[PDB]
């Protein structure tokens, strides 16, 4: 009889919890009690980039740590040389309603998408001297919320239709679909090996996905409200999440659980962005009250604040050499800190 | 700087000029968000997303419709929200108040005013004169309400009070609601311009410290 499926699900919901609690011998704070503190940090603004006419919704760093791309309500992508501030290209969008952009790890291509349910791929290396669309990827039934390249021929995307998907750009078709979330999917992060990825959704959970097998490995469920941003730890063995809960949380793959949470009684607004420094010792988070907090990832202390925007911070990112932090905002600027 | 760097700097001046020139043309316009449930007449109040454009009295408008908890943050800087209500069914009319109370109180829409079209007044006049059913079975206060045709005037004013009440009870002064009735009607492009003029005038008084 069909009602017995709820009985079998209850037995397993107990067995997962019993296994996870048997591992819990000591906390990360009980181990890291003797390691020395970061002290205080004092990063300063080294550049301001100007030229968008409206809100900035996303940015992404290029593989060489010198180029970056930005996406805005004003209907343009812009590619910047961060050292000089010079604009390299400005690209006109076919819709104003973009929510995402990404840079290919070769520097040959850029991607964007949003409320029109399509992901567009732009070729930066034409013989005619232009930038133009190479491919339009269509098949989601809702707004695209994040995208990330694996190479010049494969890309992963997430949407408001509750799925993620993997695409072959040369064929213009899906090769796998990833199914199991019950809310809209907000954000996505690839592991350093590119064999796995994680995503977070408005049902207040995160999942671990096998790219090659096409299926779900583990699910993580500590939050009490929607997840907006997610990021792998540099070692590929842990990740962090940020939520409308007004807290960040660190999760471990091999212990299958939460290690610690970052929060304070004077912090009340939701988290828009999260990122890790090159050693993993600093965790950076962006907030709806328009400045960034910097946390000691092991001690859970707060080390300093990047105060400098006068409207909310919408995107965040650290260079692969660990030299600098970029932040974008609804004030139409983006700033670089060091 | 080198001979390549001064050439790459002159390129960026032409990008700055061409971005800024395209910034003047867009800022001429006004932007509208359109909302309303199925069979409300939303597609014909003027005659993954849809967009339509018009001009009246030398002012020109863009209007958007989506084929909403997350994406509504993208519309935090429109001039107005247009909200369309079916008045021909008394049964689903509670869903119209439930949707309206969500959009009015939303934390990212604290400064945007609403233009409200109560649609299908002809099917409402036909049913209130035919007399087979009564609003009072769904909204009991109609059994005691009387006016501020002599039959239909009682119904249409009561139904229009039910939206304006749930607005004014928590409006917080920054934004306003502008009701109208729609049928083969044609004037609706003038009605929205006469309210977009008033919204911009209400902003100009606060910027000059008059209010």
């Amino acid at each position, epitope marked *: 009889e069909l009602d017995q499926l709820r009985q079998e699900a209850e037995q397993l919901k107990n067995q997962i919890r019993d296994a996870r609690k048997a591992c819990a011998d000591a906390t990360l704070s009980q181990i890291t009690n003797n390691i020395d503190p970061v002290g205080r940090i004092q990063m300063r603004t080294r550049r301001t980039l100007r030229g968008h006419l409206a809100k900035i919704y996303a940015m992404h760093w290029g593989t060489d740590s010198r180029l970056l791309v930005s996406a805005s309500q004003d209907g343009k992508l812009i590619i910047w040389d961060s050292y000089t501030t010079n604009k390299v290209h400005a690209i006109p969008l076919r819709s104003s309603w973009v929510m995402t952009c990404a840079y290919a790890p070769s520097g040959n291509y850029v991607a964007c998408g949003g409320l029109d349910n399509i992901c567009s791929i732009y070729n930066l290396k034409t013989r005619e001297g232009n930038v133009r669309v190479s491919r339009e990827l269509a098949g989601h039934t809702g707004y695209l919320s994040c995208c990330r390249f694996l190479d010049d021929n494969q890309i992963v995307t997430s949407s408001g239709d509750t799925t993620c998907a993997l695409w072959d750009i040369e064929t213009g078709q899906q090769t796998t679909t990833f199914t199991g979330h019950t809310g809209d999917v907000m954000s996505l992060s690839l592991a350093p090996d590119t064999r796995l990825f994680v995503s977070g959704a408005c049902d207040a959970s995160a999942k671990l996905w096998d790219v090659r097998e096409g299926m779900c490995r583990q699910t993580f469920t500590g939050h009490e409200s929607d997840i907006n941003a997610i990021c792998f730890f540099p070692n590929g063995n842990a990740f962090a999440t940020g939520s409308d809960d007004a807290t960040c949380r660190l999760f471990d793959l091999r212990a299958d659980q939460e290690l610690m949470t970052y929060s304070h009684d004077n912090i009340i607004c939701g988290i828009t962005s999260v990122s890790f420094s090159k050693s993993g010792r600093l965790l950076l988070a962006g907030y709806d009250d328009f400045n960034c907090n910097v946390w000691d990832a092991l001690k859970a202390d707060r080390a300093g604040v990047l105060a400098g925007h006068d409207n909310r911070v919408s995107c965040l990112g650290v260079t692969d050499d660990g030299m600098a932090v970029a932040t974008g905002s609804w004030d139409s600027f983006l700033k670089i800190w060091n | 700087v080198s001979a*390549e760097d001064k050439a790459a700097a002159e390129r960026s001046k032409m990008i700055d000029k061409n971005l800024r020139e395209d910034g003047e043309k867009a800022r001429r316009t006004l932007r509208l968000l359109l909302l309303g449930a199925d069979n409300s007449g939303k597609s014909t109040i003027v005659k993954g997303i849809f967009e339509t454009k018009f001009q009246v009295d030398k002012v020109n408008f863009h209007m958007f419709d989506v084929g909403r908890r997350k994406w509504i943050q993208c519309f935090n800087d429109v001039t107005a929200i247009i909200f369309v209500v079916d008045s021909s069914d008394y049964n689903r009319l509670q869903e119209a108040l439930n949707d309206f109370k969500s959009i009015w109180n939303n934390r990212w829409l604290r400064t945007i005013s609403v233009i409200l079209f109560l649609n299908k007044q002809d099917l409402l006049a036909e049913k209130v004169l035919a007399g087979k059913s009564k609003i009072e079975d769904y909204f009991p206060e109609f059994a005691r309400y009387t006016t501020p045709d002599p039959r239909v005037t009682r119904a249409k004013y009561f139904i229009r009070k039910e939206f304006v009440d749930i607005s004014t009870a928590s409006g917080d002064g920054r934004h306003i609601c502008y009701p109208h009735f729609t049928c083969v009607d044609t004037e609706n492009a003038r009605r929205i311009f006469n309210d977009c003029k008033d919204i911009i005038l209400q902003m100009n008084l606060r910027e000059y410290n008059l209010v």
Partner: single-chain antibody
Amino acid sequence: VQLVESGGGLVQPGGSRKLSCSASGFAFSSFGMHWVRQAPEKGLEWVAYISSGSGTIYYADTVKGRFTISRDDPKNTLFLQMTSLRSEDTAMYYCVRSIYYYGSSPFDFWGQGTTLTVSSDIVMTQATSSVPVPGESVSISCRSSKSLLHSNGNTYLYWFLQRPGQSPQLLIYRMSNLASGVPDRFSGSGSGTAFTLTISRLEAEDVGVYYCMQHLEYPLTFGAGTKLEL
């Protein structure tokens, strides 16, 4: 992608001319444009430059005041107007496209020229004049009077290849980088002042002439270049 040219011919001393060149298949307004010349038995020499947006214009001292360079973007056309023509101006003239931003490769494509017959600069040298070369490696070297390496971390040296009877084409840009469609058997490297190009496994159709050019400062200057033989 194409550039085509008209003008040239025979001119009596002291006269004037206009050359014209028409682009097709590319975003012409976005490219900087150069005129480059060669005498009937001598190396490449640069004549003039005009920017994108017409905002800056350069000449060598041998043409300064006698020549005007101009463009007509709605018609995709490049012009050179020149007066007081001497026997010393008798040259093949080519136009060239260029574009400048982080990661670009200028001197990318060349027209096919019109021959004209009239009846503090960086000195750079190629040590050989001609070399006997198949299947073996071959190597060529160029030296500069001053350093081509700049505080920004780049070196502004280029290598050009000319096959017999054909316009020249780019091999290498900014000392190290290889131009699109050029075989992976080509390479080059150097110090701040002395540079080398290496060919691995030489073949037919690699036979030609090799020119080294600097782009540190205007005027742009060339070496004499080295010929190869089979």
